[PDB]
């Protein structure tokens, strides 16, 4: 395509999964989209205290073209509510959608999303906004001063988070300790109405 | 003023379906409908310029400008006795749509039950009450069910003021819609009704662009995000204080666009679902015409026609 960025895929699960993951950061706020040859990233921040970055690499798309030359990456800002409503209305017939294409033509142009079916194509253009002065890179891990590291199975952590949510947890404490004989202790301690 | 008509649904079901669709459309469009019984065909009109309809002031209050015209050849009725001393033995009347719709619904129920009787329609002078007469309708039910409907006859002067809208054919782009019974019929039916998924959308922008050699798009700009719905399947093109409306200059010689109301589009979708041969005509920034044609042959017979004219809801 003639656009500066154009990526098309046949797996609609990735997009809806990304929106689902971004939802907990607020149904009505801004989302930053970073585009580069490596891939496309969604970034959200809350209260200057928490940040989420979800990456979609080239491999996830059956076609991926990034023709920009002046800049190695492109930054834009959109409203999450617009995308959420548009996708919810367009994704009602999820069984029939066969292709999804994202496109962008640089600063001053909208972010274009096209759902292509067998005979019907729906094209939506999202207006873009100036990016806030706050830098997403500000909140980052100091790779040279790690206090501790741990690897956990997704299912167990998700179950623990569910349990904490169901008891109305108000404060959380991550406790990590190591001893000899390969003894390890990782725990989550919750302060809630239960105590 | 003898208007003896016999209607049978077991013979030529296409004509009965056409009549049912016509009455349903006129009932859903306006409260009252005009019936013109000529020596050759019956014309059913739903227009805001009628004496009864104009009593609602629809045009000024809600912009009810669309006009529905339906033609039924005399061959539809088993018996067609229409004798008059007017031009071409024409008799004009105005009737209420709800009563006719209820009577036809009862007839449909009786037919579905298993009866194969015929409906006799005549004009009668009711002594109970532009004199007002009654439409005596009767039919057997395997019991002689008879119902009467008020009707108001019209004069020649009143009749002549109701004239079918015409369009500038030379400045008019027509598209032959895919047949509903075809493999693409379901796809086009879904494409037409797609915009209904957005409740808050009131106006839709229809666009037609050359280069199956043309394409049709529905644009919605009432939402927080611009929306375009495109049809990529096959689609063939057929080859006082009053002032004229202002027309925006066409972007190109091969693009025709018009903005219309969503209700008119729903009516067009229903009409498209009803019939097989449908043509959509656009007069750029002027109007949209939905023409449903039913073809029957024996010496080809008369073609059943339903033409719905929709004026633009907004300027371009």
| Chain A closest-CA separation from residue B196 CA (Å) | 11
Nearest chain A CA: its distance from B14 CA (Å): 30
| Secondary element (H or E) of residue A159 | helix A154-166
Question: Angle formed by the axes of helices B13-29 and B97-113, to 10°?
Answer: 150
Q: B84 is written with which tokens?
A: 């008059």
Q: Find, among B79, B74, B81, the residue nearest to B19 by Cα.
A: B74
Q: What resolution, expressed in A, was reported for this entry?
A: 2.1
Give DSSP secondary structure letters for A35-76: EETTEEEEEEEETTTEEEEEEEEGGGSSEEEE---S-SEEEE
Experimental method: cryo-EM
∠ CA B219-B236-B17 to the nearest 5 degrees? 90
Look at residues B62, B59, B29 and name the one whose alpha carbon lies nearest to residue B46.
Answer: B29
Helix (H) or strand (E) holding A89: helix A80-90
The answer to whether B127 contacts chain A (CB < 8 Å) is no
| A-chain residues near B191 (CB < 8 A) | 119-120
CA B227 to chain A, closest CA, distance in angstroms equals 5
Contacts of B128 (CB under 8 A, 6+ apart): none
Specify the DSSP class assigned to residue B228.
E
Q: How many CB atoms lie within 10 A of CB A75?
A: 15
C-alpha span between A86 and B149 (Å, rounded): 49
End-to-end CA distance of chain A: 59
Write out the two tokens for A18. 């990304």
CB contact under 8 A, B232 and A121: yes
Interface A-B, measured as beta-carbon pairs within 8 A, has a size of 46
- The CB density around residue B17, as the number of other CB atoms within 10 Å, is 14
Helices (H), chain B: 13-29, 58-62, 97-113, 156-160, 185-193, 262-274
Q: Read off the DSSP letter of residue B297.
A: B
* A85 interfacial to chain B (CB closer than 8 Å): yes
3-state secondary structure of B97: helix
- Strand, helix or coil for residue B157: helix
B220 → chain A, closest CA residue: A124
Give the helix, strand, coil percentages of chain A, each rounded to 5. Answer: 25, 40, 40
Rounded to 5 degrees, what are φ and ψ at A167?
A: -95, 10
Burial level of B297, CB count in 10 A (0-12/13-18/19+)? exposed
Q: Which of A25, A89, A101 is nearest to A63 (CA)?
A: A101
Structure tokens at A191: 């302060």
Q: Which residue of B has its CA nearest to A81?
A: B224
């Amino acid at each position: 395509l003639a656009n500066k960025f154009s990526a098309s895929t046949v797996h609609l699960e990735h997009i809806t999964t990304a929106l689902s993951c971004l939802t907990p950061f607020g149904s009505k706020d801004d989302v930053l989209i970073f585009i580069d040859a490596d891939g496309l990233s969604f970034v959200r921040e809350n209260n200057h205290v928490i940040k989420i970055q979800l990456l979609l690499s080239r491999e996830l798309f059956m076609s991926y073209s990034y023709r920009n030359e002046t800049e190695d990456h492109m930054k834009l800002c959109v409203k999450i509510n617009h995308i959420l409503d548009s996708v919810s209305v367009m994704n009602r017939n999820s069984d029939d959608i066969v292709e999804c294409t994202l496109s962008y033509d640089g600063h001053g142009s909208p972010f274009v999303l096209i759902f292509e079916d067998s005979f019907i194509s729906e094209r939506v253009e999202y207006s873009t906004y100036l990016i806030k002065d706050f830098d997403t890179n500000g909140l980052e891990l100091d790779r040279e001063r790690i206090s501790f590291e741990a690897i956990i199975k997704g299912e167990a952590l998700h179950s623990a988070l569910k349990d904490l949510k169901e008891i109305g947890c108000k404060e959380c404490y991550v406790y990590a300790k190591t001893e000899a004989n390969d003894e390890n202790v990782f725990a989550l301690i919750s302060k809630s109405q239960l105590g | 003023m003898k208007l003896k008509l016999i209607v049978n649904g077991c013979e030529a079901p296409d004509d009965y379906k056409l009549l049912r669709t016509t009455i349903n459309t006129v009932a859903s469009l306006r409260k009252t409908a005009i019936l013109r019984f000529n020596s050759e065909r019956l014309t059913i009109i739903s227009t805001p310029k009628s004496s009864l309809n104009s009593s609602n002031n629809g045009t000024i209050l809600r912009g009810d400008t669309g006009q529905l015209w339906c033609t039924i050849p005399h061959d539809v009725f088993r018996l067609y006795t229409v004798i008059s001393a007017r031009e071409l033995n024409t008799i004009t009347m105005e009737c209420n749509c709800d009563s006719l719709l209820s009577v036809f619904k009862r007839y449909d129920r009786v037919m579905n039950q298993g009866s194969s009787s015929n409906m006799t329609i005549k004009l009668q002078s009711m002594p109970e009450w532009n004199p007002i007469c009654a439409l005596g309708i009767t039919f057997e039910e395997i019991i002689m069910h008879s119902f009467k409907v008020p009707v108001k006859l019209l004069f020649r002067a009143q009749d002549t003021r109701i004239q079918e809208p015409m369009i500038n054919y030379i400045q008019l782009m027509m598209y032959k819609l895919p047949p509903i019974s075809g493999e693409f019929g379901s796809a086009f039916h879904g494409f037409i009704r797609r915009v209904e998924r957005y409740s808050n959308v009131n106006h839709i922008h229809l666009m037609g662009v050359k280069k199956d050699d043309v394409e049709l798009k529905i644009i919605v700009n009432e939402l927080d995000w611009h929306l375009e719905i495109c049809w990529n399947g096959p689609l063939d093109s057929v080859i006082d204080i009053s002032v004229m409306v202002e027309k925006a200059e066409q972007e190109s010689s091969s693009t025709h666009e018009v903005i219309i109301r969503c209700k008119d589009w729903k009516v067009c979708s229903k009409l498209y679902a009803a019939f097989e041969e449908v043509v959509l005509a656009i007069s750029h920034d002027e109007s949209c015409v939905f023409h449903c044609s039913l073809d029957r042959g024996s010496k080809p017979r008369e073609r059943g026609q339903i033409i719905y004219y929709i004026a633009r809801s907004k300027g371009l």
